[model samples]
Each structure stands twice: as C-alpha cells, then as structure tokens.
Target chain A: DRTPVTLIGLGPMGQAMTRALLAAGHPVTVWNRTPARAAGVVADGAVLAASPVEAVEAGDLVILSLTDYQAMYDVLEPATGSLAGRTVVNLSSDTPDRTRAAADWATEHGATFLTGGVMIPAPMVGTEEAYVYYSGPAEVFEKHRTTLTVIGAPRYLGEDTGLAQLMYQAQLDVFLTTLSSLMHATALLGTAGVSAAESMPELIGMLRTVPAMLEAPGADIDADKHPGDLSTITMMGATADHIVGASETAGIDLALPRAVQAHYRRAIENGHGGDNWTRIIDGIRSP
Target chain B: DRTPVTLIGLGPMGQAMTRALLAAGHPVTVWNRTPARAAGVVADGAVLAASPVEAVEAGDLVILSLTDYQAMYDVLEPATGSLAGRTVVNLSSDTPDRTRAAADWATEHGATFLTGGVMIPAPMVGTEEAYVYYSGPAEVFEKHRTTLTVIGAPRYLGEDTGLAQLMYQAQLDVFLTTLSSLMHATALLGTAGVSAAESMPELIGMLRTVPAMLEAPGADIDADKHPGDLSTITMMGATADHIVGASETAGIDLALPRAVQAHYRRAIENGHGGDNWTRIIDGIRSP
Candidate 1:
C-alpha cells in the first residue's frame, strides 16, 4: 500500500509531475485522456491505471496534475464511478476561486481535497530549487509529503487551497515587472551612443542608486532641491529625448516612460525644474 | 600682480563661480547688471567692477558665466571694446552652434578663448568635488591650468567646448529615463500590495540588476530574441496589468504600459505568445 500519484494531464508541467513521482519510486498510477500519453510514465517504471476509476482507488493519496479545474471536473471526477474515501490533491493551472470551489465539492464527495500551485517550468522538475505551493488540508499534505517533495520544493501555506493560487499570481507580478523595466532601460541606453564599455558602468551605477529613494523623490521634487539627489528636472528633461531616440530606431510608440519624461520637463519649465522628478506626482495628482 | 579673475553675472551658478575664484586667492573682480548685487562677492575680498569697460581690463582672464550665449553677447562683448590679448573663458550655457560661433568671434578679437562647463553646485566651490570642463585653445588651457584647477577639477576634452555641454545633456537623458522607470516600478509594486517589507528588497534587487543589463536587455529586445532570453510575450502581457494596477492607485494614466502589454498579448494570442518580448518589436512595427 504505497502512496499513489495519479497524473491526469500529459502537458509539459503534468509530465514533469509524473516523472518526479515515478523517479521517487512511488506507485504513480497515471491515467491520461489519451492512453498513449501515459506510456512514458509507464516506461519510466510507473503503474499505468487501467481506467479513471481504477486510478482513484489505486492510492490512498491521489494527485491530479491537470490543465485546469474544469478539465479535472469534466474528465476525471465524474468518470464511470465515485471517488470516495480518497484524499485528492489537485495540481492544476487555475484561479483561486475555482480551486476553493473544487475543494468544497471534493469534500462533499466523501474525499479530502487539496490544491497546489507549481512554481516552475516542466524541465525543472525534481530539483530542489523548482517548487510547488500547497494549501488546503494540512494532514493530507503531511501524509503525502514524501512523494510531493521529490518533484520540487513543497511549500504548505494553509487550509484554504485558494491562497496558494493567489500567492502564485502575486509572485508572477514581481517576476514579470522586474524583467519589463530592465528591458526598457536597456533599450533607452543603447540610444546614448555609449559603447558597451562606457554603457556598462554608468548604467549599473544608476540602477543601484535610483530605487533607494522611492517615496522621498515625490516630496523631494517639490522642495528647492528637486532632482537634488542627482541633477535637476530640466536636466533629466533634456536627457529624456534619448529614449525617444532609441524608440526611433525601433519605430514604435512607447508612451509610458516618454509621457512621464514630457510631464517632467513641463513641470520643470513651470518652475518645478529645480525640484526632483518625484514631483511628477504633482502633474498627475494632488500628491 | 596676482592671477586676476574677472567674473560676469551673479546668479546662483555665477555667484558660485565668483566664490570659487575668490577662495582660490585670485584677485577676483566681479560685475553684475545691478551694482548692488555685487556686494556679497565684493565683501569676500572681491573688487567690484565699476563698469564693463573697467571689468574687462581689470583681469587677465575674463570668465563669462551668464544664463546663455545670447545673454553673454548682449551684456558683455557689446559694452566692452575688443577683447584683444585677453584670455576669455565663456562658462555660460550655449548650444553647440553658438559655442562654435562664439569661438570664431573671440579669435577675431585677438583673444584666447576656452569654452568651459562647470560640473558642480555653487556650494561645492573650492571643494575637491568641483570640476570644470574646458575646450578650445589647448595652449591657453595649459597656461591657465593651475588657476582653473584651484577652483576645481579641470578636464580638457580638446578644443570643442560644446562637447562638454553635449555630454552633460547626454548624461541627463540616461539619468532621467532610469529615474522614470524606477518610479514606475515602485508605483506598480505599491499598487500590488506587495508590502514595503517585500517590495524594498525586490525593488533594490531590480534597481541593481537593471544597470548591469542596460545593453543586454536592448540587445535581447532589439535583436528580436523572440524565442529566447526572457519570460515571453505572454508574460509581458501580465506585466502591463501590474503597471496598470499601480498607475491607477498612484492616480496616473495606465495607457502606456497597457499598450505595450496589449501588443505583447496580441502577439502571443497570435501564436507568438511563446516567443520572447523582443518579438514585440516585430509585432508593433509590422502592425
């Protein structure tokens, strides 16, 4: 009576989950909609479930690595027979609201339910750095902890499985935003005619210094020392033209940074030139 | 018989220049439009020039530190006779074209001209940080090096003084563009409710990382690394939403970040979603 991991999808992430379980030597009984999709897990020493019903009963701890909760509900749970007396762990790409609803539905069906937000690409499976987040029944997670950790780092948040999904979205916001601005600054600096040599140190020195004054810059821009931490508003105003120069190279209309630049120049021209750029808040709002 | 330094104008920057010259033990003669305005410098052991005619002959070196080139031409040269055998260092603001024209005019008057750009605040006068840039006659600059260095660090960038002005303008562009994006990111993170606790480190990390990749990010985005080097256009779409959330909270328009986000999303929806954000260059340009 080994722990059972039932993978229901054959996508890259789903296959990664199955591979981790099979590699961990658990009785991973995978059942995919297309049976051919289950062959790789079987070839990797997994026990392919003969049917969806058999897959549920094959393990005390049942895991569904599916694309979404709708597909999980449509294809797996209502198939052929009941999933009673089983603890279900869902690893799917889904919204928190859906996962919360699924948890309630699973409990009414004589089963315990859990949800996981996997935090990595398919190829990163089995590495400690790659990870998954779990929320829902704590006991169910602890019971299958040995099997879950093999695929990636297993983070247990709380009893509301929906919470893990929320955190995942939050982290994604951080990951994506950081990358976007870096790409933006890079594009702008290339227009400066700074060779790879001069560009490197100058740009790096700036990045290291810029964010340290997030809140003060707004208030500082209003003081006599506007742009005091570095230069003046009129100065930054004149320089903002370069990013526009870079944009010309690509022939694309970028309003975000450029709009802010224009606003900065106008504010300076109107006497805020001595104030810092944080005064851009003045142009947009009372703050 | 000491090194005679004559200063024109008494604005914040001009006053700073006078202070630097006086502090350096030069026999400083200062002049301003209003005679009463010269008191503060005159009190600091500076001689008040009774008229433009007197000030021109009072010093071997005449420093013009007015608002702009037109201001200098109107105020100084017209009232004074030809600046024959004098060393004229125009430290005022002037466009590149104006600098070239002024240099030619100085040569016609038989005066040695060296255009200069001051690189520090008035308060920094006589301090180690005060630096000035010179371009024009190399021989004149070399002869006056000791006197100039006493006021601050004197850099010689060859005979085109306009290049110093160009460099400062170029530096401003990089500075402001970076500042604008940093503010944009902070505004977004604050909107995400990421908490100052979580955001400060993340923000600092991003600030540090961006400067290093100023060129790489452009190379990646410009080269249309459509399938490599980043998270993909699909993810960039999400970043737009994050910026939108931040812009809304900060009481600013989200039109720009949103546009880029839309471009990325559209590109991905059209089967390039798996491609990197650089492909957005093609996406926006072609569309």
Candidate 2:
C-alpha cells in the first residue's frame, strides 16, 4: 500500500506528478484552481478534490508544484485546518530566502515542510533521467523517500530548507546563461552567412570540452588558487577582447560578449593579469 | 619521402607543430624571433634556421603559428622573395577581415595562401582530439592535407580565406562566455556556503542537457521560426530574471545574468513571448 498524495496546482508539472503518483499505485488526490486542468490526471485514477481543503485532508503527503511560493500560500492558507499532520513538499521555483520563509510558514500551521527543486522538465518527471534537489527534515524525507522516488531521484541536501532552492537557482544560472550564449554565438556566425545547422555541431563539440577543463579548476576555485601554467588571464583576456572586436564587426548583439569581456577586464584590473582564468571568480564572489 | 616544411614562430604551439612534423618524418625548418625558444624543437631534430629568409627558402610548405596577422607581416616582409613559390599556411588568431586581408597580401607577394585556426591548445596539438579549421584554395588545401594532418585533423571550410577565422571566433565566443557563466554560478553557490566541488558535478550534469535541447532548435533558429511546444520565451525569460535576482540577492556579479535577461526582455517586448527562447536570436542578430 502506497502513501496517499495530495497534489495542488494543475500546471504541466503538477499534472505530470499526479500521473506519476497514480502510476505508482498511490491514491493521488489532485486539486487545481481550474477544475478542467485536473481532468486528464483525474481520468488516470487520481481523485479530483473539489476544494484545496478537501485535497489537503485526503492525504498525509501534500505536494505543491505551483509557480512560486506565493502560490503556495494562496492555495494552502484556506486549508490550514487540515495541514496539522501532513508533510508539505513544495516543488516550486523561487529564491532560497522565500523557500526558507515558506518552510517556516508551513511549520506555523503544524505541518512538516520539505523543499524541492525538480531538475527535469514535465515530460521527464517520472523518467529514469529525472532527479530533484531536496532539503528539510531528513526523517520526513526518508519516510516518504519511496513515494518521492516515484517522481524522481531524490538528492537531499541538508535540513536548511533553502539549500534546494539555492542549488536550483545556481544550476539554472548556468543553464540560462549558456542558452543565451549559444544563441549569441549562432548570431555571430549567422552574420558571416553561416547557418545554425552548419555551426551547431561544432559549437556543441566546443561545449563538451568545458567539463574536462573545469574539473581540475573546481577545487582551485574554492581554494582561491588559479594556477597560470597552462593558460593565463592575460592570454584569455586578450582573446576576450578579440571576441568583442569580432562581435562588433559582425553587427550582432554585443551585450553577452561585452559582459564576458568585462569579467576578464575586471580581473586583470585587480592585478590578476598573470593568474589563471579561474581568478575571475574572486572578483565575482566579491562584486 | 615527406614534404619539407618551414615553421615560423617557435612558441609552445609552434614547437609542438615542429615536433609533430619531425616525428612524422617531415624535414622541418623552424625560426623564431627569440632563438632560445627553438632549442627544444631543435633537439628533436628540427633544423633551426638562422633567419626568416633562411626559413622561408628552406621549404615550399611554409607554416606560420604566430600571435596575429601583424606578426605574419613582420616575419615575412623581409622574406617576400622566398614566399613567391611557397604555400603559406597561417595558423593564427585574428579577425576574419584581417585574415582575408592577409590572404590577399600573401597572394600579391606570389604565394598560395591558406588560413587555419587551431582548435586545441599546445599539448593537444597532435593528439587525436585535435582539429584545425582551414579555408583557402581547395586544391592547395588538398595538396598539403596529408602533411597538415601531422598537426591535427584538418576541417576544410571553403575558398574564402576568412571562413576559418569566423568559425574559430564564433566557437571561442561560446567557450569564453560559458567559462564566465560557470564561475558566476560557482560564486553564487559559494555565497550560500556550497563549495564548488559539491555544485560543479550537478552543474555539469545540467549543462549536458543543453545540447539535446539545442539540437532541434538549431534549424528553427535559422528559419526564424521558434516553436513554443516544449518551452516558451516568457517562461524561460522569467527564469532568467530569477537568476539575475538570485545573483543580486547573493551579492555576486550580475553582468552576465542581466545581459541574458535583457535578451529575453527584448524578445518578449518584440512580441515573441509566446515563441520559443530561440526567438531571442532575432533580436541578437539585429542588435
């Protein structure tokens, strides 16, 4: 017998989670602002609750896959009476501070709180590739670990509640910036009459090289030691300048390259000209 | 029997090239502005030519691994007489326009000019993973293709001498920006007491997801048709905004995320909110 799960917010992510829970033989009670949004999952064996209060009362494990923490409050505030013994897991996107505050908000309502950041898209929610960052009480996490595993692999950070959100934002920081950078590079090559199909394979090949380069530097970044044996800041900064020059000549958007160039310039100005490119992180950490 | 080659500029890259050529049974003549730089390659059985003129005259296949196009002019100006019948392959970093100009200058001096961009660092010069982009006369490229393979795999671009440089810069643009973004993400996590070692593994895992996401979007980018089935510009743009907010809250540098956010904002402002994130390429192409 599986633990009963109550999932609110019928967005694509919420719908996917509801289906996954139902597929895992859990009695899933789902609620959404628009009842029509829950129809598909409801047909898949999940019980559709008419109200948020009914949803919360139907299960001991309540999952919120809303847009943000504010939505959590809006949906759960009216259901406070039913929240006393439930475990509330918020898989929403928000800041660490907001996540911490939401944890406190749930605690005040006499419920155990756990925070999660799903690392995969809606279609991948229950797939083997799916994983989620989670933080809160370890016992609460371990108690329902089997249920959450039906959704995704659970990587519990600690009891801070905010670590999960921080990890999510940090990971998205890299992902979002990389996507923009790819488009920027594609645009740069496009100006020279190169098609995206023609350049993307090579661009992807170049991106693959980054992980190996960054592996050894990971510890150096934390130690504040950027060795310049293989490549120096001056050499890299010069290339950064040249990239900006090339972008200017291409007549494409210069914002991304200019911003990258600024990192090198700032590092060089801080007397790290002879240090490795990792030295730029110091300025970033401080600035 | 192998082709005799002349290599100028005995930097780490030049030295590596000379050793590769010599190891491949090619009689290599090398020259450098500072003669001491040639000692290691000379010990490896490469002939140390006393002057640029001597180096250029020693072989019909003349390769230049130099700082820039200006260095090409500096080294070859006095040796123009020997350049007349030689095949001049310049493997240097410069703008496409400079590369095109250098090609013309070499042709005017009675040389067959080919431009190349080495994609790997010095140590990887002759390794299986190394590859170089080339653009010039197809016939000339074909003639020396085998000999050039000693340095790296040659990816011939086209007849236009500038194509190789453009490809190099476009690739580097992605590389440099990604590096800066990685450091920025690390610093953001550091603020929350997350060490680089803990964050980078998951961060790299997230980066691995980008290539697949980008694969289908490549054609859409060139066609200016951004399908919004998987992800919409508004949704991703909001995430970009959140990253910026997170960075700002963490007190780290905001330049990169801000620039990325601006791309989404401009795209949304231009009525691409319902389109895919690739729609932002339109603004970048024009801006």
Candidate 3:
C-alpha cells in the first residue's frame, strides 16, 4: 500500500488534495474542525478521521493545509503525541518566520516538517501543470515524492524549511502589488471613459517586457552595478511623476503610484539620478 | 524630394531619429539648444540648423522631440513664423493636459500638431521591433505614416492629441508600479539570501498569469459583475495582510504592500467582501 495520506484541513485545497490522492489509489485519512464537511470527500473514497489525533495516527504522511500559522498549532497541539516519527508537510500560508517556527516545533515533537507553498489554485492540483515551492529535509521530501506528485510537481528548495514560505510570500509580494496597481490604473482609465476591458490589452502589452527588464537588472543588483546605460532613475522618476499626475487628475487614489514615486525620488536625491531604477533596492535595504 | 525632414531638440533620442531618417534616404536637418550635441548627427549626413527658426524652415515636415511640454513652448515660440502649413510631430513626454495644450498652441501658431509617444529606448528607435503611440488627425498621421516607419511601427490612437500621452502614461503606470513592486520583492528575497537573479524565473512564472487574471476581471469590471465565483475580496484581503506582515518582519519598506493592503481592506469594509478583487477599483474610483 502506498502509505495512507492523512490530510488535515478539509478546505477547498485540502478537499481537492484528498480527491487527487484517492484517485491515485492512495488511502486518504482526512479531518476538519467541522466533521460534517468531510461527507463529500468521504463519499468520494476518503476515510474520515474521528479526531485530529485519529487523523495523525491514520497515516505516515500527514499533510497540513490550513488558513495560516496559528491554525497549525490549534490543530496539531491536541494530537502532538501522534506526530512522533512521522512526516508533517505543512502547506499553510503565513509569514516565513512563522513557517520556520512551525518547522522547529514539529521537529521537537519528533516529526519531520516540510514547508510547502502551493503556487497554483485548487483546480490545478494533481496536474503536472501545477507546482509547489518546497523546502525541508531532502531525504524526507524524497521519501514522499511520489505521494506528493499526486497533487502536483514538487520543487525542493533547500534544507532551510523556511525558504518555501519566503518564496511564496515574495511571489505574492509582486502578484498582489502588480494586481492592485493595475486595478488602480484601470480605475484611472475608467475615470477617463476607458473601460477595464479596453485597457487590458494595453496593460498586457506593457507587462511583456517586465521579465526581460528585471532579468538584466537582476544581474546588476547581484553584482552591485547600477549602470544607467539604458534607462535612468531620473527618467523613471519623471514618468512616475506623470503617473501621479494622471491618477490625481482622474480623482483616483494616489497611494500606489505615490508610494513608487517616493522610492524613485529618494533614490534620485541620494545621487542615484544617473543610475538604473534597480538602484532603488538600495533605498529599501537602507531605508 | 522624399519630403525633407527637420528635427529639433537633438537629445539622444533626437539623434537616433536623425540617423534613422538619414539611413532611410530622407534628407535630415537637426538642431538642439546645445550645438555641440548635434556634431555626430551632422557627421552622419544631417545638415545642422543654426536656430530653432532655421531648423523649422529647413524642411516641410518638422518633428519636435524635445524634453517636455513646457520645453515645447520654449523651443517653438521663437520659431512660430516658420511653422505655417507645416506639420509638427511632437515626440515628447508630458502630462496629457500639457500635451493637449501643446497641440492647441501649435494650431494657434498655424502648425499641425500630432502628438507622439515613443515606447522604445533610443537604441531601438529605427527597429521594426519597436513601436510608438500616436494620436492626432488621422489624415495627418496617414500622410506621414510612410515616413514615420523609418523609426518604428506607428499605432495611431485617434484624433485626440492627449490620447497618445494618456496611453503612454497609462502604460507607464503599470510598468513602473509592477517593476518597483518586483524590486521590493527581490529585496525581500535578498534578506533570505536569495538573489534577484535566482528569483527572476519564479517571479516571471507568477507574472505569466497577470494578463489572464486582469482579462477576466476586466470583463467583469466592464459588466459591473463582481462575482466571487473563484476568489473573494475577503480572501485577497487576508493574503494582503500577510504580505504586509512579511514585509514588516523582513524589515523592508512597508509602503508598497501596505498600499495594496489598504485598497483590499477598503473594498472589504465597504461591503464588497463577497465580491472579486476587481471591486477594489470601486474603492479607488471613489476614495
């Protein structure tokens, strides 16, 4: 038997994972706070655990996918004894620090903790198209690789258990900011009679270069080179100024653009006028 | 005569345009506030005009690619007499209102003004790979489309001179915001010993879906549909809080993530919790 998988937390993602594992012929033991929520998955060939302790005892590979860090403690503290000599793969969303703490707490209880950050949504779970950022003991990860693949591709980061969580938050750092900024921009365009539908193409057109743009500067940032061979902070600052003007004129909230503008201005005033906008990282590091 | 061209404001971009025009077999005349800066272009077979007035008179089609809108007035005011019946193509960067004002001012002086915004850098000025945003009289744009192709593809917006500048700024709104947010994330990664170079691919991977994400939301925005079929504002808001929390714990500047979090929270508090993240636009529109 492929070691029975205990999936604690029957939220959308957890439920999806249970189905995927069962489809792959792995017995899945699941437990949720509201045991009634497990009916669907249980009907779909999952074995519902009587309690968190029973869930922990039901399988060698225990997967914890909860809302955040505190919930991890809330669910596991009652079943701490059963954690010994088993693998606890936490796929929760929280601060890197929090994830690191949980990894330590699990280890103390004689459990192997692997932090996993799911990059795709629930629908993509179990597909090759889906992947997760994972960090923990490589041996433990290798042990459960096949079972984990039942959900998606597993990208092992390193021995540092907190790395996956850091990557997750970092990605969200860009995702949420860019998304919300786009909303701010779409609204600005809307104020001028341009619908979001109309602006989407143009916005996508502009975003096409972001990867390349960041690629070149990424090397420079690593090497500590802030050359202005192509574009300069002064140039970017002026454009940022124009964006602020557009936002203000359109009566849209200026928080996003203004925040970016403030960064540019600081870099320029600190004598980075002739440097690339990537020199902006210096401000963040020192500010 | 292939319609000889007069180009004023010989900055780097102006010089590139002059070289492109000359390479395309168009006799080019160039002028700048500083005469010495035109030496290279003049060496490239461009005739150097002694003054703005003389520059405008050198050809039937005049192109003004100056620093900004105010600079437009400053440079063109003394050359008013030479502008009659000639088209002045302004490839400058400025606010939409300033660009529209320049268009009006050009017409007042008996010159046809077509506002242009070059989306590429100076180095890409003549390549087919680059394109520009143009808006003014469609007839005027059509008449010069053949000549403008020497620089790059021309995307004519419409009759509104401000439209070109508006599009330019709107695109920058997303570009700079996304880019700056990426920098912030990269810096956050740096705190964990991850270089921007290392994180580039993963960052890009997350960005690939941005267009698609915006597309669905854009349609909903157009239709005023804020359904939370897949994700809700309440969900996005919690993630935003964690982002801010991560930023704070990482000891980085909290402005960017904090700004985004504010918008999401605003939308949720305003009773759009059950709606999608696109409803954040309403917050920006009204607040």
Candidate 4:
C-alpha cells in the first residue's frame, strides 16, 4: 500500500511538496490556513482535510511546512489530541533554537519530530536533484524515509533536533550573502551599461571557484595555521578598499562592500594582516 | 630569435612571470624596486637589470606585474626615454580609471600599453589553469600573444585599456563577498562545534545551486518582471530576519547579514514587497 502522508500549511513550498507527493503517487492529505488555497493541490488528487485534527488523523506521517514555529502552534495546537504517537516532520525554516523548542513541544504531545532544511526551491521539490537535510530520532527517519523520498533526497544529520536547521542556515549563511553581493555588483556594473545577463557567467564562475578555494583555508582554520603564502590578510584588505572605492564611484549602495571591508580592516588592525585569510575566523570567533 | 621580455616589479607575481618566461625559453630581463628580490630568479637564467631604464632598454616588450599604476610611473618614468616604440603590458591590479589614465600616460611617451588583469594567484601562473584578461590594441595583442602565453592564456576584452581591469574588479565584487561570508558562517558553525571541513560539501552544494537558480531571476530582472509567483521580497526579508537572529545567537559579527537584509527591507518599504527577489536590483539602482 502507498504510504499515506498529511501535509500542513500549503504555502509555495508546502504546495510544491504536495504536488511532488501526488506526482510520486503517495496519498496526500493537505490543510492550509486558507482552505481555498488547498483547492489547487486538492484538484491534483490530494484529500483536503476538513479540519486540522482531521488532517493530523489522515496519515501516519505528518509534515508541517509552516511559516515558522509559532504558526506551527497556531495550527497544531487546535488538534493536540491526534498528535500523540504520530510522526511529524517539520520542514519549516526557523532558527535552531526555535526548532529545538518545537521539537520539545512535539515530544510533549507524544509526537516524534524531525526538523528539516530543504536545500532546493519549490520547483525542484520532486526532482532527483533536490535534497533535504533532516535531524532527530534515527528510527523515525528510517521508517518514513521512503515517503520522504517523494519530496526529495533526504540526508539525516544527527539525533539533535536543531542540527538540520543549523546546517540549512550554515548553507544559507553562504547562499544569501553570495546572491545579495552579486545583486550589488550587478547594480554597479549597470551604472556602466553592463547588464546582469552579460556578467552572469563571471558571477557563476566565481561561485564555482569559491568553495574549492575555501577547502584548504577551512582545513588551515581547523589546524590553527594561517600561512601567508596563498594570500595575506593585508593584501585582501587593500583589494577590499578598491572595491569600496569602486562602489562609491559607481554611485550604488556602499553598505555591502563597506561591511565586507570593515571585517578585513579590523582583522588588520588586530595585527593579523600578515596572516592568511583563515586568521579572520579567529576574530569572528573571539569575544 | 624569440621575443625577449623585460619584467618589472619582481614581487611574487613578477617573479612568477619571470620564471614562466625563462621556462618558455624567452630571454628575460628582470628589474625590482628592491633588487635583491630578483636573486632567486636571476640564478635561474634571468638578467637582473641595474635599473628600470636599463630594463626598458633590454627588450621590445616590458611586462609590469606591479602593485598599482603609481608604482608604474615611479618605476618607469625615469625609463621613459627607453619607452619609445615599446610594447608595455601592465598586469597590475587597480581601478579601471587608474588603468585608463596610465594608458594615456604610456601613449604620451610613445609606447603602446595593454592593461592586463591576471585572474589567478602567483602559484598558478604559467600553468594551464591560469588566464589573464587584456584590453588595448587588437593588433598589438595578436603580435605579442605568443610572448604573453608564457605567463598564462590571454583573453583580449577590447581596445579600451580599462576594460580588463573593469572585468577583473567586477568579478572581485562577487568573489570577495562570497569568501568573507563563508568565513563568517564558518565562525558561526565553529561556535556549535562544526568544523568547516565537515561542512565543506554543503557550501559547495550551495555554490552549484545558486547559479542555476539565478538564471531565471537574472533573466526576469532584465525583462523588468517581478512576478511574486516564485518568491516575494517580503518573504525574503522575513527569512533574513531569522538569519540575522541566528547569527547573533551564535555570537558572530552582524554586519554582513545586516547589510544584506537592510537592502531587502528598504525594497519592501519601497512597495516591492509583493515583487520577486529580482526586484532588489531596483532598490540598489535607485536612491
């Protein structure tokens, strides 16, 4: 028999998951704040639960893709009776602390909770290419792993409820910053009549280069070595200054490059300018 | 009968070029502000010129791997007498404006100037992996392309002497921000006992995904479409808040994320809240 799944909160991401589960031939029961919004997925062979409690009762595995943990409570609190002994996977994006608290809340109601961080956008949800990070009780994950596969490839991090969100955010810490800076750069280029489309390849090439470059520095950071041979902090600081100046010259917002340079400049003032770029990690880590 | 090359500013980059030219069987004349810096390469079949003037006189082609344009004048102004009909290839990293002015100055002295921006670090020079961007006369580049090949593969941008430097800086605008954010994220993860080497794959996975993700948004940005179907500016602002809170909870610097979020928040305030993330380029472009 197909694994019947219940999905709560039909936002864009949640809706995408519903579509994937339906496409993968799973029996999906969904509920949303606005019942009308679930109509689209309901038309795609999903069962629209009449109430939150009814949705909770429909499947052995319940997935909450709400806006945040608070929204989780608003929706699930009305139906605590059905939560006991149910396996709930929360794919909501939130801080690690919030995820842990929600995990405890789920446990108090005798529901097992697995926090998740989806790495792909909604459109890629059902595809083999998308992957999601999950953390919580290992048994709960192994039991529902097949059903979860309908949404994306799943990687179980550890038993800690917060691990998945932390990893998601860790990836996000790089992702958001990289994308935003590219936007800023695109604007700067636009001032000179260059389009984002024209410079897109250079930005993508940079994305390919950054991770490989960081591998050695990451190891050096772990080993507490700041070899100056690759590049010196002083040199980086100078380059950062040029970037700042260039941004100003182009008349765009200076906040992004200015913030980046401030970090490098402080590392230099603290006398790590001669050290490799890895040494700045200490500045961030220290009080 | 190979084209002899004169190398100026024997720092790490200049020395690497000297080594590459020698290895490629070109007669190499090297000059450095600090002359002793050339000793190691001098022993490897390089001619250590007594001064920049003699260096300029030694070869028809003078290659400058300098720190900046000012260094170019300081090193070569005294050698201007020897600059007539010479082809000077400057691989210094600096502002596009500075490069343009330096090009004019070189032309005034009866020399043809081709500004260059090397994309690789010193160690990667002469290897198949390194390549340089060049902009000046197409004919000059065609004539000396073989000699420049000794340093790295040459990419000719245009006749504008500043185009190469502009392209280089444009890349840097994306590169530096990505690396710095990774460092900050690594620091945050370290507070939770996660080593960057342990988290390396996740970051690389993000790098791979972002470019593909950007393709549609970048196209949409050019077309002036900000459909909220994918993701809205308001939604991104909310997620950014979580990221900011998480970073603060982890005790890392707040500047990077704060700056990024500030731009998004302003966009929402400007009534693009319902617009797509591509709408951000507008906020950056406007006052």
What TM-scores do the predictions have? 0.54, 0.93, 0.92, 0.93
Candidate of highest DockQ: 2
Question: Global lDDT of each model?
Answer: 0.62, 0.86, 0.84, 0.83
- Which regions of candidate 2 fall more than 4 Å away from where they truly are? A213-216, B213-216
Off by over 4 Å in 3: A10-12, A33-43, A213-216, B10-12, B212-216
Give the docking tier of candidate 4. medium
**Two-way DockQ contest, 1 vs 4, winner:** 4
Could you give the CAPRI-style class of model 3? medium
lDDT of predicted model 4: 0.83
Q: Which of candidates 1 and 2 reaches a greater TM-score?
A: 2
Best-first order by TM-score: 2, 4, 3, 1
Interface RMSD of each: 6.9, 1.9, 2.0, 2.1
Candidate 1 error regions (>4 Å): A1-261, A268-277, B9-12, B32-42, B48-56, B64-70, B77-82, B87-95, B108-112, B115-134, B182-250, B253-287
Better candidate number, 2 or 4, judged by DockQ: 2
Give the Å error, residue B274, model 2: 2.7
List, residue by residue over A82-147, the lDDT tens digit for candidate 1.
667778788765555667888888887878887886666566678755667788888888877778
Instruction: Give the fraction of true interface contacts kept by model 4.
Output: 0.49
RMSD per candidate (Å) reads 8.7, 2.3, 2.5, 2.4
RMSD to the native, candidate 2? 2.3
Error of 2 at A172 (Å): 1.0
Stretches of candidate 4 off by over 4 Å are: A212-216, B215-217
